[PDB]
Design a protein around this ligand. Structure first.
Ligand SMILES: [Mn+2]
Length: 437
């Protein structure tokens, strides 16, 4: 609910537009400033982070940092932000955990005010109240942010999907979303990542079923390559390993921090004595182990090339091994997969083929996005989290749902959307850019 009569709204993207990552969206209501996410981008073509010079010059007015989910595209730059500025950090139980770990990992001694929020939390400020709602993503406890103004709600979806099989901390708040919609949404800021792809995602249970049928035929050792970010896909192989009386080992010699924190907080459903350390692998027959190679940048692929070319520090591929790629390939990574496949074949490994009829994504396709648009019914729309072609795609979806085209804004980094109370205008441009580290 609303506090006072507001005058000025400003919306400034410093990251996540005209590119696919580095989420950072500034929202101002009068004299108060809020930062929605603080992602990094893995330089394609270490890391890249947004230019926050605009924020620093107006540091006095930054009331909070709001973090939608635990991925590096949301919270990857937070440590670097907190070095230059002191503001309170708001996020879910899991998101705060992962941020704190990033701070511990960088040996940063700065004292930080962390506020754990949930879909029942309602954070109060001078000009506005902020609420939250659960979304569906590849990681549990993902939140949408709802900034309540006199003009209506400013909603930032974060990254989201709509899957009728995900039903835990992965489940969405369709009633809280419908209520936000009818109370009236002034502005919607939504994920455009798969806005070009017609229809829907393949449901996760369908993907799991096809993985099961594939893995059940494997007579030898099985190695699965995954993104560490994709908690669902990891949960899926744990389920399958258990039903096939196989045991699971990650690449060594300890367990991946994100996975291991979430595991210790009870986010994974793991039976007893299912994980064996990589040091205990040799003891078991080849057909009783599933090895999972996780990573972030695209190492998941690199690791298999190093396992094929003998040449892995820990463990190498043997003839009769089965390989499965439980990832979704960026066009930048299509060639290195084809090299790796060749080397896998030479080393005499069986390639479990991906079903081409399956579409796996953390992000909603056209119909999923239209779903959020139909629910929200925003007056103004700002498609983000995509390149220019993706933003356009999302805009056409919005126009179809009945948002006025005059009220849809396609913006670049540093663009400033202002609302006087009469007209919404793109009238300014501020300092923005890419800081490589
Ligand atoms: Mn994500």
């Amino acid at each position: 609910l609303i506090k006072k009569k507001n005058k000025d709204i400003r919306i400034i993207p410093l990251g996540g537009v005209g590119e696919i990552a580095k989420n950072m969206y500034i929202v101002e209501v009068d004299d108060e400033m809020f930062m929605l996410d603080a992602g990094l981008m893995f330089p394609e073509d270490d890391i890249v982070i947004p230019d926050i010079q605009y924020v620093i010059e107006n540091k006095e007015r930054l009331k909070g940092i709001f973090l939608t989910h635990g991925h590096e595209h949301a919270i990857g730059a937070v440590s670097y932000v907190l070095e230059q500025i002191d503001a309170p950090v708001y996020g879910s139980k899991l998101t705060i955990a992962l941020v704190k770990e990033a701070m511990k990992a960088r040996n940063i001694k700065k004292k930080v005010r962390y506020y754990t929020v949930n879909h029942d939390s309602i954070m109060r400020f001078k000009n506005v109240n902020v609420s939250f709602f659960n979304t569906t993503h590849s990681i549990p406890d993902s939140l949408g942010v709802c900034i309540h103004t006199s003009y209506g709600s400013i909603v930032y979806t974060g990254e989201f999907k709509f899957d009728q099989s995900l039903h835990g901390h992965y489940a969405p708040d369709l009633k809280r979303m419908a209520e936000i919609g009818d109370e009236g949404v002034f502005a919607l800021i939504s994920d455009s990542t798969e806005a070009e792809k017609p229809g829907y995602n393949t449901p996760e249970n369908i993907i799991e079923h096809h993985m099961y049928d594939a893995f059940a035929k494997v007579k030898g050792r099985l190695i699965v390559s995954c993104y560490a970010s994709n908690f669902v896909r990891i949960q899926q192989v744990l389920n399958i390993a258990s039903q096939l009386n196989r045991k699971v080992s990650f690449l060594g010699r300890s367990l991946e921090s994100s996975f291991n924190i979430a595991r210790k907080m009870g986010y994974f459903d793991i039976p007893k004595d299912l994980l064996i350390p990589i040091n205990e692998v040799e003891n078991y027959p080849k057909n009783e182990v599933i090895i999972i190679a996780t990573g972030m940048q695209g190492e998941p692929v690199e690791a298999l090339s190093q396992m094929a070319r003998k040449k892995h520090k820990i463990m190498n591929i043997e003839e009769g091994d089965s390989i499965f790629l439980a990832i979704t390939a960026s066009a930048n990574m299509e060639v290195i997969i084809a090299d790796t496949l060749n080397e896998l074949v030479r080393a005499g490994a069986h390639i479990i083929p991906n079903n081409k009829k399956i579409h796996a994504s953390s992000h909603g396709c056209m119909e999923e996005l239209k779903m959020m648009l139909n629910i929200m019914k925003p007056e103004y729309f700002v498609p983000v989290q995509g390149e220019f072609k993706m933003q356009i795609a999302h805009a056409k979806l919005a126009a179809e749902t009945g948002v006025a085209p005059e009220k849809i804004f396609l913006v670049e980094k540093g663009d400033v959307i202002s609302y006087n109370g009469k007209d919404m205008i793109l009238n300014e441009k501020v300092q923005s850019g890419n800081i490589l580290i």
